[PDB]
Coordinates of C-alpha atoms and ligand atoms in Angstrom, one line a residue:
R1 CA 19.9 14.1 -30.5
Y2 CA 17.8 13.3 -27.2
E3 CA 19.1 11.6 -24.2
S4 CA 18.2 11.0 -20.4
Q5 CA 20.9 12.2 -18.1
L6 CA 19.8 9.3 -15.6
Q7 CA 21.6 6.4 -17.1
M8 CA 22.3 2.6 -16.0
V9 CA 25.9 2.0 -16.0
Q10 CA 27.8 -1.5 -15.8
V11 CA 31.3 -1.6 -14.2
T12 CA 33.9 -3.6 -16.2
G13 CA 37.2 -3.4 -13.8
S14 CA 38.4 -1.2 -10.7
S15 CA 39.3 2.3 -12.3
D16 CA 36.9 5.1 -12.5
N17 CA 36.8 4.9 -16.5
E18 CA 36.2 1.3 -16.6
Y19 CA 32.1 0.8 -17.1
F20 CA 29.8 1.3 -20.1
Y21 CA 26.3 2.6 -20.5
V22 CA 23.3 0.1 -20.7
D23 CA 21.1 1.0 -24.0
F24 CA 17.8 -0.6 -23.3
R25 CA 16.9 0.0 -27.2
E26 CA 17.1 -3.7 -27.8
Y27 CA 15.2 -4.9 -24.7
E28 CA 11.1 -4.9 -24.9
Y29 CA 9.0 -2.7 -23.4
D30 CA 6.6 -4.4 -20.5
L31 CA 3.0 -3.6 -22.0
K32 CA 1.9 -3.8 -18.3
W33 CA 2.9 0.1 -17.9
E34 CA 0.4 0.8 -20.8
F35 CA -2.3 3.3 -20.1
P36 CA -5.2 4.7 -22.2
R37 CA -4.3 8.4 -23.8
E38 CA -8.0 9.5 -23.4
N39 CA -7.7 8.8 -19.5
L40 CA -5.3 11.8 -19.8
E41 CA -6.9 15.4 -19.8
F42 CA -4.2 17.9 -20.4
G43 CA -3.7 21.2 -18.1
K44 CA -0.6 23.5 -18.5
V45 CA 2.8 23.1 -19.9
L46 CA 5.3 22.7 -16.9
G47 CA 8.6 23.1 -18.9
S48 CA 9.8 22.9 -22.5
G49 CA 13.3 22.1 -23.8
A50 CA 14.1 21.4 -27.9
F51 CA 13.3 18.0 -28.4
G52 CA 10.3 17.9 -25.8
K53 CA 7.9 19.3 -23.2
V54 CA 6.7 18.6 -19.9
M55 CA 2.9 18.8 -19.3
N56 CA 0.4 18.8 -16.2
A57 CA -2.7 16.5 -16.5
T58 CA -5.2 14.8 -14.7
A59 CA -5.0 11.1 -14.6
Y60 CA -8.1 8.7 -14.4
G61 CA -7.9 5.5 -13.0
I62 CA -4.0 5.6 -12.7
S63 CA -3.7 4.9 -9.0
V67 CA -10.0 8.0 -8.4
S68 CA -8.5 10.8 -10.1
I69 CA -4.8 12.4 -9.6
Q70 CA -2.5 15.0 -11.2
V71 CA 0.4 13.6 -13.2
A72 CA 3.4 15.2 -15.0
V73 CA 3.6 13.7 -18.7
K74 CA 6.9 13.8 -20.5
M75 CA 6.6 14.0 -24.6
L76 CA 8.4 15.2 -27.7
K77 CA 7.6 17.9 -29.7
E78 CA 6.1 17.5 -33.1
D81 CA 12.1 12.4 -35.3
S82 CA 12.3 8.2 -35.4
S83 CA 15.8 8.4 -33.2
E84 CA 14.3 10.8 -30.6
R85 CA 11.1 8.5 -30.4
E86 CA 13.7 5.5 -29.6
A87 CA 15.4 7.5 -27.0
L88 CA 12.4 8.4 -25.1
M89 CA 11.4 4.5 -25.3
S90 CA 14.7 3.6 -24.1
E91 CA 14.2 6.0 -21.0
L92 CA 10.7 4.4 -20.6
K93 CA 12.0 0.6 -20.3
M94 CA 15.1 2.2 -18.3
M95 CA 12.1 3.6 -15.5
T96 CA 10.3 0.6 -15.8
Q97 CA 13.3 -1.5 -14.5
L98 CA 14.5 0.7 -11.9
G99 CA 11.4 0.5 -9.2
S100 CA 10.1 3.1 -7.1
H101 CA 11.5 5.0 -4.4
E102 CA 10.1 8.1 -2.2
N103 CA 12.7 10.5 -3.1
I104 CA 12.7 9.9 -7.0
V105 CA 10.1 11.4 -9.9
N106 CA 8.6 7.6 -10.2
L107 CA 7.0 6.3 -13.5
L108 CA 3.4 5.9 -13.2
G109 CA 2.6 4.7 -17.1
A110 CA 2.9 5.4 -20.6
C111 CA 1.2 5.9 -23.9
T112 CA 3.0 4.2 -26.8
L113 CA 0.8 2.2 -29.0
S114 CA -1.9 4.5 -30.5
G115 CA -0.1 7.8 -30.9
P116 CA 2.9 10.0 -29.7
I117 CA 4.9 8.5 -26.9
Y118 CA 3.8 9.8 -23.2
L119 CA 5.8 8.9 -20.1
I120 CA 3.5 9.6 -16.9
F121 CA 5.1 10.6 -13.5
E122 CA 4.2 11.6 -10.2
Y123 CA 3.3 15.1 -10.3
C124 CA 5.5 17.4 -7.8
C125 CA 3.2 20.5 -6.9
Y126 CA 5.6 23.1 -5.7
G127 CA 8.0 22.5 -8.8
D128 CA 11.8 22.5 -8.7
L129 CA 13.9 22.9 -5.6
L130 CA 15.9 25.5 -6.6
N131 CA 13.1 27.8 -7.2
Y132 CA 11.6 27.0 -4.1
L133 CA 14.4 27.8 -2.0
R134 CA 14.4 31.5 -3.9
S135 CA 11.0 31.9 -2.8
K136 CA 11.7 31.2 0.6
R137 CA 14.6 33.7 0.9
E138 CA 12.4 36.5 2.8
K139 CA 10.1 33.5 4.9
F140 CA 13.1 31.7 6.5
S141 CA 13.5 31.5 10.3
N160 CA 4.7 28.7 4.5
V161 CA 7.9 29.1 6.7
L162 CA 11.5 27.7 5.8
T163 CA 13.6 26.3 8.8
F164 CA 17.6 24.9 9.1
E165 CA 15.5 21.5 10.1
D166 CA 13.7 21.7 6.5
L167 CA 17.2 22.2 4.8
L168 CA 18.8 19.3 6.1
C169 CA 15.8 17.3 5.5
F170 CA 16.1 18.3 1.7
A171 CA 19.7 17.2 2.1
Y172 CA 18.9 14.1 3.8
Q173 CA 16.2 13.3 1.1
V174 CA 18.3 13.8 -1.7
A175 CA 21.0 11.7 -0.7
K176 CA 18.6 8.9 0.3
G177 CA 17.3 9.2 -3.7
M178 CA 21.3 8.8 -4.8
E179 CA 22.0 6.2 -2.3
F180 CA 18.6 4.2 -4.1
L181 CA 20.3 5.1 -7.5
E182 CA 24.0 3.7 -6.6
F183 CA 22.1 0.6 -5.5
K184 CA 20.3 0.5 -8.9
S185 CA 23.8 0.7 -10.9
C186 CA 22.7 4.3 -11.9
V187 CA 24.5 7.1 -12.3
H188 CA 22.8 10.9 -12.6
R189 CA 24.6 13.3 -15.3
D190 CA 23.2 16.4 -14.0
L191 CA 22.4 16.5 -10.5
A192 CA 21.7 20.0 -9.3
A193 CA 18.8 21.6 -7.4
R194 CA 16.9 22.6 -10.5
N195 CA 16.5 18.7 -11.1
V196 CA 14.7 18.0 -7.6
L197 CA 11.4 18.7 -7.4
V198 CA 9.1 19.5 -4.4
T199 CA 5.8 17.6 -3.2
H200 CA 3.2 17.8 -0.3
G201 CA 4.9 17.3 3.3
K202 CA 8.3 18.8 2.1
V203 CA 8.9 15.5 0.2
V204 CA 11.8 16.1 -2.2
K205 CA 12.3 13.6 -5.4
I206 CA 14.8 13.7 -8.0
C207 CA 13.8 13.8 -11.6
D208 CA 15.6 13.6 -14.8
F209 CA 14.6 16.7 -16.9
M216 CA 20.8 27.5 -24.9
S217 CA 18.7 30.2 -22.9
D218 CA 20.1 28.7 -19.6
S219 CA 23.7 30.0 -18.6
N220 CA 24.4 26.8 -16.4
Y221 CA 24.9 24.5 -19.4
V222 CA 27.7 25.5 -21.9
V223 CA 27.5 24.2 -25.5
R224 CA 30.5 22.0 -26.5
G225 CA 29.5 20.4 -29.9
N226 CA 26.4 17.8 -29.1
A227 CA 27.2 18.4 -25.4
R228 CA 25.4 20.8 -23.0
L229 CA 27.5 20.6 -19.9
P230 CA 26.6 21.6 -16.4
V231 CA 30.2 23.0 -15.9
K232 CA 29.6 24.2 -12.1
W233 CA 28.3 21.0 -11.0
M234 CA 30.8 18.7 -12.5
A235 CA 33.4 16.8 -11.1
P236 CA 36.9 17.1 -12.5
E237 CA 37.1 13.8 -14.1
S238 CA 33.6 14.8 -15.9
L239 CA 35.0 17.9 -17.2
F240 CA 38.6 17.0 -17.8
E241 CA 37.9 13.2 -19.1
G242 CA 34.3 12.7 -19.6
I243 CA 34.0 10.3 -16.9
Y244 CA 30.4 9.9 -15.0
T245 CA 30.2 7.7 -12.0
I246 CA 28.6 7.7 -8.7
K247 CA 31.4 9.5 -7.1
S248 CA 31.2 12.1 -9.9
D249 CA 27.7 12.6 -8.1
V250 CA 29.1 12.8 -4.7
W251 CA 30.8 16.1 -6.1
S252 CA 27.5 17.2 -7.5
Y253 CA 26.0 16.4 -4.6
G254 CA 28.2 18.6 -2.7
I255 CA 27.8 21.5 -5.3
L256 CA 23.7 20.7 -4.5
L257 CA 24.2 21.3 -0.8
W258 CA 25.8 24.5 -1.2
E259 CA 22.7 25.5 -3.3
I260 CA 20.7 24.1 -0.2
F261 CA 22.6 26.1 2.3
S262 CA 22.6 29.2 0.4
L263 CA 19.0 29.2 -0.2
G264 CA 19.7 28.6 -4.3
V265 CA 22.9 30.9 -5.2
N266 CA 24.4 30.1 -8.1
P267 CA 27.6 27.7 -7.2
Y268 CA 31.1 29.8 -7.5
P269 CA 28.9 33.0 -7.5
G270 CA 30.3 35.7 -9.6
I271 CA 32.8 33.5 -11.3
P272 CA 32.3 33.0 -15.0
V273 CA 32.4 29.9 -16.9
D274 CA 35.7 30.4 -19.0
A275 CA 38.8 28.7 -19.4
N276 CA 40.0 30.1 -15.8
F277 CA 37.0 28.7 -14.0
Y278 CA 38.5 24.9 -15.5
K279 CA 42.1 25.7 -14.1
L280 CA 40.4 27.1 -10.7
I281 CA 38.9 23.3 -10.3
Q282 CA 42.1 21.5 -11.6
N283 CA 43.9 23.4 -8.8
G284 CA 41.8 22.4 -6.0
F285 CA 39.5 25.4 -5.5
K286 CA 36.5 24.9 -3.5
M287 CA 33.5 27.4 -2.3
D288 CA 33.3 29.2 1.0
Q289 CA 31.0 28.0 3.9
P290 CA 27.5 29.6 2.7
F291 CA 25.4 31.7 5.1
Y292 CA 22.8 28.5 6.4
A293 CA 25.5 25.9 6.4
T294 CA 26.7 25.1 10.0
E295 CA 30.6 24.0 10.4
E296 CA 29.8 20.2 10.1
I297 CA 27.5 20.6 6.9
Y298 CA 30.6 22.3 5.6
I299 CA 33.2 19.9 6.4
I300 CA 30.7 17.3 4.5
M301 CA 30.5 19.6 1.4
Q302 CA 34.3 19.8 1.4
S303 CA 34.5 16.1 1.5
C304 CA 32.7 15.8 -1.7
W305 CA 35.0 17.9 -3.2
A306 CA 38.2 15.7 -2.7
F307 CA 39.9 16.1 -6.2
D308 CA 40.6 12.3 -5.8
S309 CA 37.3 10.3 -6.2
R310 CA 37.9 7.8 -3.9
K311 CA 38.5 10.6 -1.1
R312 CA 34.7 11.5 -1.2
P313 CA 32.2 10.0 1.0
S314 CA 29.7 7.4 -0.6
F315 CA 26.3 7.9 -0.6
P316 CA 25.4 5.7 2.5
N317 CA 28.0 7.5 4.7
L318 CA 26.1 11.0 3.7
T319 CA 22.8 9.6 4.4
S320 CA 24.4 8.5 8.0
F321 CA 26.2 11.8 8.5
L322 CA 22.7 13.9 7.6
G323 CA 20.4 11.6 9.4
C324 CA 22.6 12.3 12.6
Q325 CA 22.6 16.0 11.9
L326 CA 19.0 16.0 11.5
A327 CA 18.3 14.0 14.7
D328 CA 19.8 16.9 16.7
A329 CA 16.2 18.5 16.4
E330 CA 16.5 19.4 20.1
Ligands
C6F401 C1 10.2 15.6 -15.2 C2 10.6 17.5 -14.9 C3 9.4 18.2 -14.2 N1 8.6 17.5 -13.6 C4 7.4 17.9 -12.8 C5 6.6 17.2 -11.8 N2 6.8 15.7 -12.1 O1 5.8 17.5 -11.4 C6 7.3 19.2 -12.9 N3 6.3 20.2 -12.3 C7 5.9 21.4 -11.7 C8 5.0 21.8 -10.7 C9 4.8 23.3 -10.5 C10 5.6 24.4 -11.2 N4 5.3 25.5 -10.6 C11 3.8 25.8 -11.2 C12 3.3 26.8 -9.5 C13 4.1 27.7 -9.1 N5 3.5 28.5 -7.9 C14 4.4 29.9 -7.8 C15 3.7 31.0 -7.0 N6 3.3 30.0 -5.8 C16 2.6 31.1 -4.6 C17 2.5 28.9 -5.8 C18 3.4 27.7 -6.7 C19 5.5 26.8 -8.8 C20 6.2 26.2 -9.8 C21 6.2 23.9 -11.8 O2 7.1 24.7 -12.4 C22 6.3 25.4 -13.7 C23 6.7 22.3 -12.3 N7 8.2 20.0 -13.6 C24 9.2 19.3 -14.5 N8 10.2 20.5 -15.0 C25 10.3 22.1 -14.9 C26 11.1 22.3 -15.9 C27 11.0 24.0 -16.0 O3 11.6 24.4 -14.7 C28 11.2 23.8 -13.2 C29 11.0 22.1 -13.7

């Protein structure tokens, strides 16, 4: 069964487990987002999962013509409804510079299309990896700091909107013009562990997610720490050379944290470590993180 990894939550109490997920299934879709099918000229496939795909297209008159990314299902009615819920969620969220924003949708006369902003340089993980020889076209320490700042800003927006990202990682951040980055939502991949219905990004998950299935904004701070390690290693797999097995679960339970990656300063590393506090209440907030990285970045000589 399909589900979006960006989820709205409502808090029902002060403890981490006191919340529920907001289902938009019973809410009505605002028809001002509806865009004509025939104004999409489909180009190439950008990625496929089991339940769907993201395709490049030219969109005529959506903003004049622009590139877009179009999310769609593969050729059930439950899958259709989940995509509508995601659409309804994204219509209500509002836009932000550091989110992959919804531009429109095609829902009435054919298969469901969700039309998003196109991010011409693809995912941040592959971007970082392609720049390893070209680190001083050229990638710098300041660019890495800027990417970190932008992701934190994106997450601060999601915190403010009462949302959680259940899969924050460099693979789910995209890169567009001007070194702008944007947080996106969405078997062969060894970073996800199969466990019944679930596909778990184990090495990105906070303990309370691993052990109790709890996802809060503070779980996202942990994942953000992992993503920082990805940035400042130029896209190394977290916990490099450590397999995902029952020993991994024990390592995390006992307070195992990664070392300082090569491109991190000591100050960036202290921030990473704070994100990995076992107790969620000791982790910094996203407004804290934007302040710390903004101050680090503001040291551009
Ligand atoms: C909603 C998920 C998603 N949204 C977008 C989006 N809204 O725009 C998106 N775009 C995207 C854009 C461009 C590329 N390319 C092609 C050119 C290539 N070249 C290499 C050679 N070099 C010299 C010049 C650049 C760099 C990668 C791309 O990767 C194929 C994806 N992709 C999304 N999902 C995928 C799932 C599979 O994994 C990555 C993310």
